[PDB]
A paper describes a structure:
Inosine 5′-monophosphate dehydrogenase (IMPDH) is the first and rate-limiting step in guanine nucleotide biosynthesis, controlling the gateway to guanine nucleotides. IMPDH catalyzes the oxidation of inosine 5′-monophosphate to xanthosine 5′-monophosphate (XMP) with a concomitant reduction of NAD+ to NADH. A monomer consists of two domains, namely, the catalytic domain, which is an eight-fold β/α barrel, and a subdomain, including two tandem cystathione-synthetase motifs (CBS domain or Bateman domain), which protrudes from the corners of the homotetramer. IMPDH is also a promising target for antibacterial drug discovery.
In this study, a CLas IMPDH variant without the CBS domain (CLas IMPDHΔ98-201) was designed. To get the CBS deletion construct, 104 residues (98-201aa) were replaced with a G amino acid, and the catalytic residue Cys309 was completely conserved. The crystal structure of CLas IMPDHΔ98-201 was determined in the apo form. Crystals of CLas IMPDHΔ98-201 appeared after 3 days at 293 K. The resolution of the diffracting crystal was 2.55 Å. Finally, the structure was refined to 2.55 Å resolution by using the PHENIX software. This crystal protein existed as a homotetramer, which is well conserved in other IMPDHs. The space group of CLas IMPDHΔ98-201 was C121, and the unit-cell parameters for CLas IMPDHΔ98-201 were a = 143.13, b = 134.86, and c = 85.62 Å. A comparison of the structures of CLas IMPDHΔ98-201 and BaIMPDHΔ95-200 showed that the structure of CLas IMPDHΔ98-201 was highly similar to that of BaIMPDHΔ95-200 in its apo form. The RMSD of CLas IMPDHΔ98-201 and BaIMPDHΔ95-200 was 0.929 Å. The flap loop and a C-terminal loop are not visible in the electron density. The steady-state kinetics parameters of CLas IMPDHΔ98-201 were similar to those of other IMPDHs, suggesting that deleting the CBS domain would not affect the CLas IMPDHΔ98-201 catalytic properties.
Residue numbers in the entry:
A (entry chain D): 6 to 88, 206 to 224, 229 to 296, 303 to 369, 421 to 466
B (entry chain C): 6 to 88, 209 to 224, 229 to 296, 303 to 369, 421 to 466
C (entry chain A), D (entry chain B): 6 to 88, 206 to 224, 229 to 296, 303 to 372, 421 to 466
The structure:
Amino acid sequence: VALTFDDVLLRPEFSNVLPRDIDISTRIAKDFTLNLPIMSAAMDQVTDSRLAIAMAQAGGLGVIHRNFSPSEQVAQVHQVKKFPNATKDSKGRLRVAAAVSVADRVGPLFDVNVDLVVVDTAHGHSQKVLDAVVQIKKNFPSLLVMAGNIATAEGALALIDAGADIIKVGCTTRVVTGVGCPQLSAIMSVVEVAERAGVAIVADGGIRFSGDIAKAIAAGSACVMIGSLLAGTDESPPYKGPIASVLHQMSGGLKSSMGYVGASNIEEFQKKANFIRVSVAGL
Amino acid sequence: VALTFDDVLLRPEFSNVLPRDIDISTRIAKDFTLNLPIMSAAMDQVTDSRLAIAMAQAGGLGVIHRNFSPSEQVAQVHQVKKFTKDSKGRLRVAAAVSVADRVGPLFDVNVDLVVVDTAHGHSQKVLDAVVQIKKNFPSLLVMAGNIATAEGALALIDAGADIIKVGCTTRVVTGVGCPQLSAIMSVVEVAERAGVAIVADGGIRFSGDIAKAIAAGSACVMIGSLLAGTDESPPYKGPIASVLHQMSGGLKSSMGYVGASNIEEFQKKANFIRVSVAGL
Amino acid sequence: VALTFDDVLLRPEFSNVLPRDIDISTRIAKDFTLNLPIMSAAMDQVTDSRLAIAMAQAGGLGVIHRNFSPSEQVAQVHQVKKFPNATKDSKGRLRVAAAVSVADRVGPLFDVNVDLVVVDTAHGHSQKVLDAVVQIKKNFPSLLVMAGNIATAEGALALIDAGADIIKVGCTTRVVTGVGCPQLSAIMSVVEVAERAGVAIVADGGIRFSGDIAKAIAAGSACVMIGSLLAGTDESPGDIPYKGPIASVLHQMSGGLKSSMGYVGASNIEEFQKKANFIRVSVAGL
Amino acid sequence: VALTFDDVLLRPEFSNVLPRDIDISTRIAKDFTLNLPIMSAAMDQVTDSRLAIAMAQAGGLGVIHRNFSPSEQVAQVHQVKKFPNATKDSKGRLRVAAAVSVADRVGPLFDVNVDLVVVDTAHGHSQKVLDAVVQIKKNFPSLLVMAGNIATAEGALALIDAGADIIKVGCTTRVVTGVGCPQLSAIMSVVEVAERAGVAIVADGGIRFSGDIAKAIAAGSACVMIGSLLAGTDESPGDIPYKGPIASVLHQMSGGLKSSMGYVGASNIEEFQKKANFIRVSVAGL
């Protein structure tokens, strides 16, 4: 059987730290570190110009969706770079990413010094998706690209071979097509090669609570991508309230789970985390 | 340990295909090819002229029922045969019979397929029925069912069946049954060795179930409840061209997920992922 | 793990038997044959004299409950034995069973010619039940005794060694005590020990539909006992979920059992228990 | 996989004891035995001084919660000590426990003759908890200490080596943090270490009925800690889900445990923990 998040629990280990000295910083790329290991999804109802700023200012990052345009989209990302310990570049302008489709229109995004461009679709192990990655690194080599989605160690190596710096893993698609893979097994399948290729992992899908974020990060993911749980908010274009209240609930939940396993940072979190397999009577 | 459709998931493979050159056509017998691998079940609340002509115009096939009295059954096999496509350009259709004299009038409307439809195909009365049909009408294609074992499949094949149909209230009343995914897989090797197509009958609710059944070895899928509320039928689904286009759209999408251009590549490339009880 | 009825399915087999000419009769004891392999439970909402007569008329058997006083229970047995394929004794009277607990009942029940005494207890594998079975057979050797309930092989051996002619295999007790055993595994764990001793088995509990009766019988039990499925009928006590005539409820159960044996290609219960194969179904295989 | 209470069932064994003469007393420490193996949790909606008095009078024990101020908690303990099978100390006064959370409590609570100090926290396998245990044992060596909660054999030995006389094993945790352990496997993972160390185990969490209490004790627990099941009682804090008199609630689970030991054929808790066999049940069995 392939495991999902509800199939396992984190085993409590000896601890000598408190959720006060606990670091949740994650290093996704070479010169790219998030204080909050959370990315916003590329949906029209989620990450806009306002939510992208709220994500960067809270310690994370948001990516701008493709259903604006090429150029009506660059108006959204350039606003983010107009503006505590937020995540911003050497220039001091807040980090931000943008979702792209599969000739490419990344020039107008790179000219605004985009921090990341996201080539994401339903099937990351495609050939037109594979050649879209080499197309972007051939034109803009210094630019960093995240590719997805893939649920296999084979698809991860294909995207890594194409030059992807980060990969994305990950329902109506299960019902309409019958295609899918439980997220926990998919995450663990693609990180044993990604940890040897030096490539970070963004888990996209299956995140319902903050406990699922703890399991995804403990499985080997450097960051999680969240969309539906950031939809009914003020900063987004059901009702959630302020964005900083939602993310603080996730940050606090992730910090408390690390205190259960006795980890002060994410590196040792993934080194001592142990999954207990629970029965169907998991309530 | 016996798997149904909901116990598995198709694993995504590397793909260079896009749902524009995807061939969902399939053969069910010699000189019998359906552009849509979907047949309409033999429910008297489903298949008649309005639905059989619609199933045939969409690229599939319909089975006009035997709940009709015998003279009204052939009178509706006549209604479909006069305006997919046979040798003479007539819209192909099928008809169901029970356990052989009533098949004579069905041959003289030049029906394209006769379905010996019962709930327990692995029985002597069905074996004797298939032998009697191929004796008086050997140029007549016979689909027989329903079975769910390799032994029942070989018994029908040995009796002269050209197509095997594999197939709840029967589970509650009798306690007898078999999960469809395991039933399909237990029959394919006996059917592929004999060159006999398999029609998956029952357990289909979504378009993903059609993709799993075909990937498991089925040459065609027979749906009934999902075509009951349609207009071309005697809830309310609406136009039958829209529900059928959704089925083919979902099948083409999953075949693109595994990287298959046609159905034969689909059945050779597909790999099933066993999913846990919580993985739903 | 231990499996229940919903964990398995009967596999279809080759069949040349038509469901009309299928014999579902069973021999629960020497010179004791039921044309309907169904017994009514000893519950005060199920089996009085009116339902026991209806159970006996349909070819089954009724077990007068012991919530009746000992004098009331004797009067209810008398009303049954004074009233086509009906369960009748050698003198042509309808047969009936009577439930006793673990002196003031067996004697009076024996002289009103009760056909079977049922030592009904939630835990048949106990010293009290073994003493009761021994004392009943010591004083009334010509009286058939069914003991229960047990769920293990060692429990079945204790009742057989105590002299029980029939053993009964069998939720609030699960939640209150945490004790229990899935009925399918309990039946299978007992039938190899029981049939070696020539003792029939009555499956008691877990029967929701006629398909469960087929599985229990195919697993090895000679007869099933149902309770709540007969609670809302006319012959059931009270004046009330109303279920209608008991004959149609029992006709539905016998119809599903005959249709099930047709899928397996069996003509009688012995062939059913020899041809039947179980297919283990997954959690999603509802 | 790791099993919870709903994953297993107790197997029926041969029995020669009636639940009338079944001894459910348990020993949690030296010169500290409870006639009812039940302890009320340290929750503000559960254990008052009134509820703790009702717990000690029924044969159990109460753990005064620590959402009281330290002065309030000392007054609640005073009211219990100054107030049949009741759990009393050498001076004939009702016994009571009190919870602390890792300086201004243990002293004053020792002065009012508290019978047990409970170091209660969500993660007992931590340095702050181990330091709290060793310092209570340093200043108050004659004071019994229960520490928790843990769920592993490793975390159990850390508490025992720190000086804990009783170990506590054990919602919102699994969804907020993704951390947890099924209670049945957690209890069975500690009994080996605790038995060789001579310390008793208190099962805290996952108990919904009296059957879970029997399974927890059969798995090796000396006592269980229930909370929500006593929250809406007469003696519980609040005013008027109302559940009624707590003596009737405790009478129900006391009867459920006794009959569960009758199925296994045990007259005391020790025989219950040796004769008990667990049956793994299917997903369809629940």
